[PDB]
Each structure stands twice: as structure tokens, then as C-alpha cells.
Amino acid sequence: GRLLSVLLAVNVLLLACTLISGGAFNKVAVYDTDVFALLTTMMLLAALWIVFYLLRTAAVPYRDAHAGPIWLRGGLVLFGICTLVMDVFKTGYYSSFSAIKILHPIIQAVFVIVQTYFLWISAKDCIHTHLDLTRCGLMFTLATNLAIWMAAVVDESVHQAHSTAICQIFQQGYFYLYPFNIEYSLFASTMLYVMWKNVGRLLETFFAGPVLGLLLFVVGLAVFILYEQALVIYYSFNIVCLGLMTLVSLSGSVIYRFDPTRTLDVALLMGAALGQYAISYYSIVAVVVGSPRDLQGALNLSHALLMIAQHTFQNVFIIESLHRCHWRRRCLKDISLFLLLCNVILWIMPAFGARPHFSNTVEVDFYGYSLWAAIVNICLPFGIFYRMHAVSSLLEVYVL
Amino acid sequence: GRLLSVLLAVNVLLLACTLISGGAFNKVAVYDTDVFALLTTMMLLAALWIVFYLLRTAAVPYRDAHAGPIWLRGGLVLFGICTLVMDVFKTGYYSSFSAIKILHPIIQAVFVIVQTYFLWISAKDCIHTHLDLTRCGLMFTLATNLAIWMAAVVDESVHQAHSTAICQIFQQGYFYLYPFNIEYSLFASTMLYVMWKNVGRLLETFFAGPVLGLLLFVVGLAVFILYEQALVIYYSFNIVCLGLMTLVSLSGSVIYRFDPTRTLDVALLMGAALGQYAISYYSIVAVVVGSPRDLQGALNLSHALLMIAQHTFQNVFIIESLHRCHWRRRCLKDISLFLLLCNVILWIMPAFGARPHFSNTVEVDFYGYSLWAAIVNICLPFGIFYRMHAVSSLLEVYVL
């Protein structure tokens, strides 16, 4: 049943994985035609099951509470809208001409609309019935989102590596919104998995931190808009933000030392941080084996090490605060604010920034454009997910 | 605790993964020096924990029964000995000259000896104490085996793609035993994971089948020794063996239709079959997008489809028999014998055969030598694992 559903998801996802990675990395010709045909079939079958579930459930005597956190649902709709805009540019590019290539955007739009509505209205639904059928359907939808994710990463790693009409605005706009589509796939997959296990079950502040964060929030805005090289202040600000975050988060852990449903929260928090760990690890290798000891190289190495340290210490601080000061209660409510404001800026740059991010120029010549682009496309969405999860967790700590 | 141990394993394995895949696929120079330094550190720390566990346990009031099946332990020792022989060729190649390169074989030999002894004498041990410390140690050892597995696959996919003294016998012999080392890593990882969850818990035949299998067993021997191209009888025999296996396994399912601790057994059986599914999927793509409709192409496509069908139907037959004929009880004991004999030959060819296997010549020009070799090295060990698991399961069915 559950194992069968898992096996099904894995087996069908494995079939998509070889089709996506076999027809794109072969030598004779790029066979992406069957990739779109299978992807269209997956969403159409996934959408058909979803509407069937909606029709037959218009069952769930008890409702979950932590299954649908607002940050998860909000990101799904925000990236779901971006996926719809991406599909508009998808069809807008198709102003020429194969048939399944044109079909793919429309069926994708229908699937994302239906899936977003279904997840919004059934995020915390504890299905007590049709357990056998729904588990396969939920897992099939989970594999569908991961199949789109895998295809999107491969498609991005091919067009970006290899770099008619007004299409330029339609093409580049379409290719700019891919990370948002990948973000939607990651956001849809985690909530589908949350519902899959949720089947057949019944269950005052100081005036120094926020101002420091707000100026960092304001200065962080002034940095990435400036670039919309010969600049080293982007690294300087990021080091200061990460360095301050590392010390501030660590200090909060010291204060606690001086004086349930969380399992998924830690797993998502620690698991999503692996995306930045991997990027930093590749960055560290590229600077100790590649570029010499220069200003840019030293700045990149310090930025990667500070990213690792900040992720680790913020994670341990959030974990400790989740488990749990006459004058330090206001301080504790103040530490969370500085990190929360500093997490939003560290969310904006990777998400809304350009695909060839500034903070990676050595790992470009060290790993090549294609390999480094693939690594970034695989890992950075986990960084965005971690940023949102950390913002939500810091809001929870402030509430507590 | 358990999650922390998992996180630890994942985090340290992720660090090894980027180091192995970053220092080998970069552009300036192949930085495998730090790969051996980290790998040596991992086993040395893993070996130190294992002997520490052995010394302090020379605790476990109750013993598991299905945790250490004989096929799992036997394969570990068989491939553990092969790993020791591989390490002998490893040091035997080092008849020149860096320092850690020479150290790596010796520490690997110590680690494999200690780990094989530890797994043999503690396969079914239900650790009721030191749960926190042992779980991290078991998971760290699990990541150590996977780190060696990942390094072995990358090392194999690099030397094979790029193709002094008598070393030729020392080098080629060393490079021939890599799949056995990878097999040991897969075998060590699964039993380490079996013990990780086993912490803090208290729990007559007919005369037509065997002769058909025995001649197929004998003929199968006569095939692969012949090659130790212009030959198409290897495909002809494999199709006959797989075709007969597909019909025989399916027929056994029909007879049943006419009239607990297994969760890991199905997961290992179905999960390991993914290795052959992936190889077949890549083979199917290479023949419908690449080579035209020729004798070799049609034979390869039929072989891949028959592999998929045989794996699926054998899996469902084994699963159904695990859940569970006045004159058909002898038949049921006879169906298992034909598949069991036919699984041994289908085990011998991928394991003891040459690295450029005969059954893949199109997926060579379609995917390139490097990509196809990497795919085969990733997937085929799962096929060998599945063959052994199927042999053990068919023996169990014959006993039942």
C-alpha cells in the first residue's frame, strides 16, 4: 500500500529520469520530444486524479494543524502564479512552427492551477478513506512534480550552457522564470509528501537589533538592484551580513546555555540547508585548487565558510529555541528579528537575481559553465526553501 | 538522535560527494589527492568506532533472526575477500614514486577486515544501550561505505573512459576487482542500515524444470567462458533464458490465482531491481532513437523488454509466494527451481564478466563510452544484489 505507492512513485520517476537524462545527454540528437510527451501524460493523469479526489470529497473527520503552515502554502501560490506566467511566455514563444511541445505549456498550466487549488484547500486533510487509492495518487503526483523539476533543471542546464523574432522577450522571460517553476515543484512535492503521511491518522524589544537589520535590509536592497567584475562590495556586504548573522545566532545559543511535530521541521530545516552546503563545498574546492590567493578568491572563500557557519549556527539556534532571562527575554525576541530581516535579503538575491550569480565566478572557470550551472540549479532552490523556512521559524520564535 | 545520526551521515556523505565529484570533473587538474585523504580519515574513524564497539560489547539481551540472512553475510565476505585482493593489487601497483595514495589501500584493508568481522558477528544484534552513540557510529560507517562506493564509481568511470612496467597485471587486476569492491560497499551499507533500525528493540518435484534449468545453467556457462561483435548467440541465449523465466514466473502467479518482517524483503527486492530497469530504459532509448531496425538492435530491444518483464513478474511471484494444488505443490516447488538456476547464470555474467559488457554496444555510441560506463557502474551492482536476493528468496520459497 504505502510501500507500493512509494515504489510506484519511484518506478515512474525513474522512468522519467532516464528519458529526461537519456534524450538530452546522448550524442546523435536531443530527444526531448518524448520528454514532453511523457511529462504531459504525467500531469494529465495527475490532474485527473486530483479532480477525481476533489469531486468525491466535496472522509476527513479530523484536521491537521501543522501540515499546512502559511509559509508553505504562500510560497506555492506565489510560485504557482509565476509558473502560470511562465506558461504564458511558453505559449507566447510558440509563435512559429512539435504538437506536444505546444500542448505542454497548456496542460502544465491546467495542472498547476488544479494542484495549487487542491493543496490550498486540502493541505491539512487527514484522508481516513480510499487510503490505498489516494496514496498511489499522491505519490504519483509527487513523482510528477519531481519529473517536472528534473526536466526543468536539465532544460535550464542546456540552454544556459549554450550561451528569430521579438521572441527574445518571450524566450528570455520564459527562461528567467524557470527557478520559480523549480521552486513550485519543490514546494508542491514537500506538501504532497506531508499529506501522504497524513493519511489514516487522527492527530518588549530593544532598539539595536531591528535597526541594524533594517539598514542591512535597506542596504541589501541597494546592492542587488545596483546590478539589477570590477565590484567587490557585494561580497563585502554578504560577508558582513553572514558574519553578523553567525555571531548573533551563536550568541543566542550562549544565552540559553548560560541559564512532537517538530521532526519534520528540523528535517526540512537541516535538509534544505544541504543546498547551500553543497554550493559552498564546491566553492571551497574551486578556490583552494583553482584561483590563487587574490582578493576575489579570498572573499569567495570567506563567503563560503561564513555561509556554512551561519547555516549551522542558525540551525542549531532554531532547533534549541523550538525545544524551549529577566532582561534577556526582550533580547531573545530581538535576536530573532535581526536574523529574520537578514534572512529576507539573503532570500531575495538568489531568488530574484540573475542566473549567473555574482558570488560564483571562480567555480565558473574551475568547473565549467555547464557543470557549475547544473550544480547551482540543483542546489539553490533548496537554499530558497531554507530561507523561507528560517523566516517562518524565526517568526515562530518571536511569537514564542 | 536517529534523525541526528541520519543528518550526520548525510552531511558527511554530502561533503565527500562534492569532494569526489568536484576534484574529478573540474577543468584545471584532477584533485583526487584530497579524496584519498578524506576517505582514509573516514575509514580510520569508522574502524576506530567499530573496534571501540567490539571492545565495550565483549547490552544485547535479545537477538534478531531475519537481520542477518546467510546470503547477505556470505556476499559480504565473498566481496570482502575480493576487496582484500584488490588492496593487494593496490599496493602492488604502488611500485613507484602521494603518501596518502599509498596509505589508502592499507587502511582500506584494515577497515574492510574489521567491518566484515563486525558485521558477521553482530549482524542481528539489537543494541539496547549506547543508542545515541552507536546510531551516529553506524550511520557514519554507512556514509563511509557510500563514500567509497561513490569514489569507486567515479574512479572506474574515469580510467575506463580514458581507454610503465609489469604493473599492467597489477593495474588491470586492480581495475577488474572494482565492481566487487562496489558490491562490498553496497553489501556493507545495507546491513549497516539493517542494524541501524535494529537498535533498542526486542523482536516432491517434477523432472522437467530442474533439467531445463540445469542445461540452461550448463549452456549459460558455455556462453560467457567462450568470450572469457560477430556473435549473436549471447543475445539468443539471454532472450531464451529471460523469455522462459518470464513465462515460468508468470505461470506460477496464475496457479495461485486459480486456487511482518517482509517489508524490507520487498523493498530490497523491488529497490535493487531499479538498477536493471534503468539500464533497460537507457537501452530502449538508445535503440529507438539511435541504431536503425537491425538484427543487433532488435535483439537488444527485445532483451531489454524481456529484462523488464522478467524482473516485474519474478518480483510479483516472489511477493505473492511470501504472503502465502494437490498435484501442483510439486509444480510450485518446481517453478522455484527453474528460476533459481536461471538466476545464478544471470548473476555470473554481469558480476564476473568484462567491464564492457556484450549486451550493450548501441548504448555505447548513443550515450558515449564515459556516460554509458558511468550508468552501468551505478546500476549493475544493484542488479547483482537483486540476483542474490532473488536466489535467496527462491530458496525460501522452495523450503516453503
Side-chain angles (χ1 to χ4, degrees):
Chain A
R2 291 177 64 178
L3 192 49
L4 154 60
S5 80
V6 162
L7 223 63
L8 177 63
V10 182
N11 254 290
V12 65
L13 175 53
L14 171 66
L15 166 67
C17 279
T18 88
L19 264 66
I20 292 158
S21 44
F25 303 136
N26 77 88
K27 293 223 169 312
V28 47
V30 188
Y31 208 46
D32 68 291
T33 309
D34 74 296
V35 170
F36 286 145
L38 171 73
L39 268 186
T40 325
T41 312
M42 295 209 66
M43 321 185 258
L44 214 32
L45 198 53
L48 272 163
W49 173 87
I50 291 170
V51 296
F52 164 100
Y53 177 84
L54 293 172
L55 287 200
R56 302 291 159 260
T57 56
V60 191
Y62 296 172
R63 181 87 162 163
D64 198 294
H66 330 78
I70 178 59
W71 77 273
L72 257 168
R73 280 182 315 150
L76 176 95
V77 171
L78 162 79
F79 295 131
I81 294 159
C82 294
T83 314
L84 289 177
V85 180
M86 191 195 68
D87 283 341
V88 167
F89 283 91
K90 242 161 174 180
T91 63
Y93 194 13
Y94 288 130
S95 64
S96 298
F97 272 4
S98 61
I100 42 187
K101 239 199 182 198
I102 276 175
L103 263 291
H104 177 45
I106 294 181
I107 323 291
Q108 171 154 51
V110 176
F111 167 61
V112 59
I113 286 168
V114 174
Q115 166 165 72
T116 307
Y117 180 69
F118 159 68
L119 288 168
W120 182 290
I121 76 180
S122 72
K124 325 183 210 173
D125 259 336
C126 326
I127 337 187
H128 270 294
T129 73
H130 292 265
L131 316 100
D132 40 8
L133 156 70
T134 49
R135 269 196 207 110
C136 285
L138 284 170
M139 267 306 171
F140 188 84
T141 326
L142 215 162
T144 316
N145 278 113
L146 295 178
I148 299 155
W149 184 349
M150 156 72 89
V153 168
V154 172
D155 215 39
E156 255 207 278
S157 316
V158 159
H159 158 94
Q160 280 179 19
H162 293 57
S163 75
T164 294
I166 175 65
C167 68
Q168 294 284 320
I169 194 52
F170 263 123
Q171 173 174 260
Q172 274 181 14
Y174 164 43
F175 274 116
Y176 173 87
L177 268 167
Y178 253 124
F180 300 85
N181 183 24
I182 291 158
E183 259 305 302
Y184 170 76
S185 313
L186 173 51
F187 259 89
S189 321
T190 170
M191 280 186 308
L192 283 162
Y193 174 97
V194 164
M195 282 166 58
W196 179 82
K197 33 165 67 183
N198 277 12
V199 168
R201 51 191 309 295
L202 60 100
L203 314 166
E204 268 157 38
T205 44
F206 278 19
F207 277 31
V211 292
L212 246 199
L214 261 173
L215 281 293
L216 280 184
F217 183 50
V218 162
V219 167
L221 259 290
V223 169
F224 94 102
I225 313 189
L226 175 140
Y227 218 92
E228 299 89 34
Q229 268 61 64
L231 184 138
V232 287
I233 58 200
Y234 164 99
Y235 263 135
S236 325
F237 160 72
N238 267 318
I239 279 154
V240 152
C241 190
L242 285 158
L244 275 170
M245 271 173 104
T246 313
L247 300 165
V248 158
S249 42
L250 159 77
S251 47
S253 283
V254 185
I255 318 168
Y256 271 109
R257 281 321 180 263
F258 268 11
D259 77 85
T261 79
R262 296 324 168 168
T263 282
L264 187 54
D265 274 318
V266 200
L268 275 179
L269 204 66
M270 301 295 327
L274 268 41
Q276 204 47 247
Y277 284 153
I279 281 170
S280 64
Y281 291 155
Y282 280 111
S283 318
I284 288 167
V285 170
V287 84
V288 304
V289 186
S291 150
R293 292 320 216 259
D294 320 303
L295 161 63
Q296 183 194 40
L299 281 198
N300 194 355
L301 160 74
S302 56
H303 173 253
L305 283 167
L306 272 166
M307 273 283 211
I308 297 166
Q310 188 263 304
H311 276 282
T312 325
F313 287 130
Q314 178 158 299
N315 275 346
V316 303
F317 167 56
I318 294 166
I319 288 154
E320 209 269 359
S321 46
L322 258 52
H323 193 177
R324 304 302 247 152
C325 34
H326 62 104
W327 78 285
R328 314 171 322 210
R329 149 168 266 98
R330 301 137 205 78
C331 200
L332 269 191
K333 212 156 282 182
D334 205 278
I335 296 134
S336 317
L337 209 29
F338 177 66
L339 297 167
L340 189 135
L341 257 300
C342 281
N343 272 284
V344 174
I345 35 175
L346 289 189
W347 170 49
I348 291 173
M349 325 214 167
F352 302 85
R355 332 268 61 77
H357 302 57
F358 193 144
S359 99
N360 326 310
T361 38
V362 178
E363 326 85 357
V364 170
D365 68 27
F366 188 74
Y367 296 110
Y369 206 92
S370 320
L371 180 42
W372 181 244
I375 292 161
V376 169
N377 283 286
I378 289 159
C379 299
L380 209 51
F382 284 98
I384 297 170
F385 194 98
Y386 174 80
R387 287 306 180 207
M388 299 199 184
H389 202 312
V391 164
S392 153
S393 308
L394 290 159
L395 256 193
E396 209 195 69
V397 175
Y398 191 107
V399 152
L400 182 136
Chain B
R2 291 177 64 178
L3 192 49
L4 154 60
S5 80
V6 162
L7 223 63
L8 177 63
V10 182
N11 254 290
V12 65
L13 175 53
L14 171 65
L15 166 67
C17 279
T18 88
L19 263 66
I20 292 158
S21 44
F25 303 136
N26 77 88
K27 293 223 169 312
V28 47
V30 188
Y31 208 46
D32 68 291
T33 309
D34 74 296
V35 170
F36 286 145
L38 171 73
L39 268 186
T40 325
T41 312
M42 295 209 66
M43 321 185 258
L44 214 32
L45 198 53
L48 272 163
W49 173 87
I50 291 170
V51 296
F52 164 100
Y53 177 84
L54 293 172
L55 287 200
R56 302 291 159 260
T57 56
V60 191
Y62 296 172
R63 181 87 162 163
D64 198 294
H66 330 78
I70 178 59
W71 77 273
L72 257 168
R73 280 182 315 150
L76 176 95
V77 171
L78 162 79
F79 295 131
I81 294 159
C82 294
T83 314
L84 289 177
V85 180
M86 191 195 68
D87 283 341
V88 167
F89 283 90
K90 242 160 174 180
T91 63
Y93 194 13
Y94 288 130
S95 64
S96 298
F97 272 4
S98 61
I100 42 187
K101 239 199 182 198
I102 276 175
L103 263 291
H104 177 45
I106 294 181
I107 323 291
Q108 171 154 51
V110 176
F111 167 61
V112 59
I113 286 168
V114 174
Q115 166 165 72
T116 307
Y117 180 69
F118 159 68
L119 288 168
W120 182 290
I121 76 180
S122 72
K124 325 183 210 173
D125 259 336
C126 326
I127 337 188
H128 270 294
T129 73
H130 292 265
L131 316 100
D132 40 8
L133 156 70
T134 49
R135 269 196 207 110
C136 285
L138 284 170
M139 267 306 171
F140 188 84
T141 326
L142 215 162
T144 316
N145 277 113
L146 295 178
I148 299 155
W149 184 349
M150 156 72 89
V153 168
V154 172
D155 215 39
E156 255 207 278
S157 316
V158 159
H159 158 94
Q160 280 179 19
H162 293 57
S163 75
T164 294
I166 175 65
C167 68
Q168 294 284 320
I169 194 52
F170 263 123
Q171 173 174 260
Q172 274 181 14
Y174 164 43
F175 274 116
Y176 173 87
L177 268 167
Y178 253 124
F180 300 85
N181 183 24
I182 291 158
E183 259 306 302
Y184 170 76
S185 313
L186 173 51
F187 259 89
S189 321
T190 170
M191 280 186 308
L192 283 162
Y193 174 96
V194 164
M195 282 166 58
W196 179 82
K197 33 165 67 183
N198 277 12
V199 168
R201 51 191 309 295
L202 60 100
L203 314 166
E204 268 157 38
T205 44
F206 278 19
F207 277 31
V211 292
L212 246 199
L214 261 173
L215 281 293
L216 280 184
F217 183 51
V218 162
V219 167
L221 259 290
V223 169
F224 94 102
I225 313 189
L226 175 140
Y227 218 92
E228 299 89 34
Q229 268 61 64
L231 184 138
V232 287
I233 58 200
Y234 164 99
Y235 263 135
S236 325
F237 160 72
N238 267 318
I239 279 154
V240 152
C241 190
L242 285 158
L244 275 170
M245 271 173 104
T246 313
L247 300 165
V248 158
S249 42
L250 159 77
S251 47
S253 283
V254 185
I255 318 168
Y256 271 109
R257 281 321 180 263
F258 268 11
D259 77 85
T261 79
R262 296 324 168 168
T263 282
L264 187 54
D265 273 318
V266 200
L268 275 179
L269 204 66
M270 301 295 327
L274 268 41
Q276 204 47 247
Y277 284 153
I279 281 170
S280 63
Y281 291 155
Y282 280 111
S283 318
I284 288 167
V285 170
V287 84
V288 304
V289 186
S291 150
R293 292 320 216 259
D294 320 303
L295 161 63
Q296 183 194 40
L299 281 198
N300 194 355
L301 160 74
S302 56
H303 173 253
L305 283 167
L306 272 166
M307 273 283 211
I308 297 166
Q310 188 263 304
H311 276 282
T312 325
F313 287 130
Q314 178 158 299
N315 275 346
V316 303
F317 167 56
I318 294 166
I319 288 154
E320 209 269 359
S321 46
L322 258 52
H323 193 177
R324 304 302 247 152
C325 33
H326 62 104
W327 78 285
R328 314 171 322 210
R329 149 168 266 98
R330 301 137 205 78
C331 200
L332 269 191
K333 212 156 282 182
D334 205 278
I335 296 134
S336 317
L337 209 29
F338 177 66
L339 297 167
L340 189 135
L341 257 300
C342 281
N343 272 284
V344 174
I345 35 175
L346 289 189
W347 170 49
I348 291 173
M349 325 214 167
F352 302 85
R355 332 268 61 77
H357 302 57
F358 193 144
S359 99
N360 326 310
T361 38
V362 178
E363 326 85 357
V364 170
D365 68 27
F366 188 74
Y367 296 110
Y369 206 92
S370 320
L371 180 42
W372 181 244
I375 292 161
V376 169
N377 282 286
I378 289 159
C379 299
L380 209 51
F382 284 98
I384 297 170
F385 194 98
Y386 174 80
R387 287 306 180 207
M388 299 199 184
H389 202 312
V391 164
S392 153
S393 308
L394 290 159
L395 256 193
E396 209 195 69
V397 175
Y398 191 107
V399 153
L400 182 136

